[PDB]
Amino acid sequence: RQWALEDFEIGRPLGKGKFGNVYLAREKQSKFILALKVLFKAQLEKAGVEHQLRREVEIQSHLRHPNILRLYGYFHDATRVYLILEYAPLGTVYRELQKLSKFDEQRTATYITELANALSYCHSKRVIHRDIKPENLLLGSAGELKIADFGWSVGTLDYLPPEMIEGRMHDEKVDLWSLGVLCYEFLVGKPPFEANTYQETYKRISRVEFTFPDFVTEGARDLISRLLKHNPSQRPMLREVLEHPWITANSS
Ligand SMILES: Cc1cc(Cn2cc(-c3c(Cl)cnc4nc(-c5cn(C)nc5C)[nH]c34)cn2)no1
């Protein structure tokens, strides 16, 4: 289908930054509510990285999973490019983590399970999302977790694996790492490697240096230690993750 800007009525801005902005949009002749991520070619030619975007569009267009934000279609005028995305009713995991300060183990273990199912789906298609962080985690009408953008899929350091930040070439286990980083943050409120400088964060991720606050339970600490280790090969498969005792005992 061929789209134009004059097919959508533009509404409330949901998010800013990254040389583009998303507005809550309702299409006119069927009243469909969707999110319209609007990037500008001027700022994108200066970035000069349509490369992964055209791929990300292709990546996300035919990805059909209930825990992945569906991308409907693309179109553009001269100066800007529109990505027509599914609308997430309940917002981001980021702001909700911001408000609750921390998640109790049930909301956390549930969030992990949904991520794994979405990743096991992406891993079934040899897709690696790389940039998994709370900012691109969204919530559906039922409040289900939904993975968002794949612009950096096939910088900001905190969720990137040791092998990835150093130069050795990734594999799909880099999401197992990111999963481990997410689980920690959900329970603590902060990333395991969060630092004050890039050069310093880089070291902590490289030496794998993190410590558990005293309120994080034993079963929790176990799963995080298995996911967040230097050697990718001995990291669990998403199967082993879902069937983790602590995951099973708290997920729903
Ligand atoms: C460029 C660029 C990236 C972003 C990040 N961003 C994504 C959203 C977003 C998307 Cl893609 C889809 N559905 C959303 N629903 C919300 C939302 C709902 N509530 C109640 N509050 C918010 C926020 N955000 C969505 C927003 N930002 N922005 O520009």
| CA-CA-CA-CA torsion sign (172, 175, 180, 181) | positive
How far does residue 221's CA lie from ligand 1's centre (Å)? Answer: 31
* Nearest residue by C-alpha to atom 6 in ligand 1: 15
Helix (H, G, I), strand (E, B) or coil at 89: coil
Greatest Cα pair distance in the chain: 56
Other C-beta atoms closer than 10 Å to the C-beta of 20 total 18
191 close to 159: Cβ distance less than 8 angstroms: yes
223 close to 246: Cβ distance less than 8 angstroms: yes
> Tokens representing 192?
């395991």
Instruction: Report how far residue 157's alpha carbon sits from residue 107's, in angstroms, rounded to the nearest whole number.
Output: 25
83 close to 71: Cβ distance less than 8 angstroms: yes
Location of structure tokens 């943050």: 185
Tell me the best of 12, 14, 90, 149 to mutate to test the pocket of ligand 1, counting ligand atoms within 8 Å of each CB and taking the most. Answer: 14
Taking only Cα atoms into account, the Rg of the chain, rounded to an integer number of angstroms, comes to: 19
Instruction: Report how far residue 130's alpha carbon sits from residue 28's, in angstroms, rounded to the nearest whole number.
Output: 36
Helix (H, G, I), strand (E, B) or coil at 9: strand
Q: Which of 158, 171, 188, 179 is nearest to 114 (CA)?
A: 179
Instruction: Report how far residue 144's alpha carbon sits from residue 125's, in angstroms, rounded to the nearest whole number.
Output: 22
3-state secondary structure 13-62: EEECCCCEEEEEEEECCCCCEEEEEEEEHHHHHCCCCHHHHHHHHHHHHC
- Give, in degrees to the nearest 5, the angle at Cα 115 between 174 and 84: 100
User: Which helix H or strand E contains 145, and what residues bound it?
Assistant: strand 145-147
112 Cβ inside 6 Å of ligand 1: no
Helix (H, G, I), strand (E, B) or coil at 224: helix
Measure CA 245 to chain center: 25
Q: Which residues contact 61 (CB under 8 A, 6 or more apart)?
A: 71, 73
238 Cβ inside 6 Å of ligand 1: no
Is 16 annotated as ligand-binding? no
* Cα-Cα end-to-end distance for the chain: 39
Instruction: Report how far residue 216's alpha carbon sits from residue 213's, in angstroms, rounded to the nearest whole number.
Output: 6
Instruction: Report how far residue 40's alpha carbon sits from residue 33's, in angstroms, rounded to the nearest whole number.
Output: 22
Instruction: Report how far residue 146's alpha carbon sits from residue 35's, in angstroms, rounded to the nearest whole number.
Output: 14
88 Cβ inside 6 Å of ligand 1: yes
Tell me the best of 92, 95, 137, 141 to mutate to test the pocket of ligand 1, counting ligand atoms within 8 Å of each CB and taking the most. Answer: 92
Instruction: Report how far residue 181's alpha carbon sits from residue 27's, in angstroms, rounded to the nearest whole number.
Output: 38
Final resolution, Å: 3.1
Is 240 annotated as ligand-binding? no
Instruction: Report how far residue 162's alpha carbon sits from residue 160's, in angstroms, rounded to the nearest whole number.
Output: 7
* Ordered domains of the chain (ranges, CATH): 1-91 (3.30.200.20), 92-250 (1.10.510.10)
Instruction: Write out the catalytic residue numbers.
Output: 131
How far does residue 237's CA lie from ligand 1's centre (Å)? Answer: 30
Other C-beta atoms closer than 10 Å to the C-beta of 13 total 11
66 Cβ inside 6 Å of ligand 1: no
Location of structure tokens 């790389």: 130
82 Cβ inside 6 Å of ligand 1: no
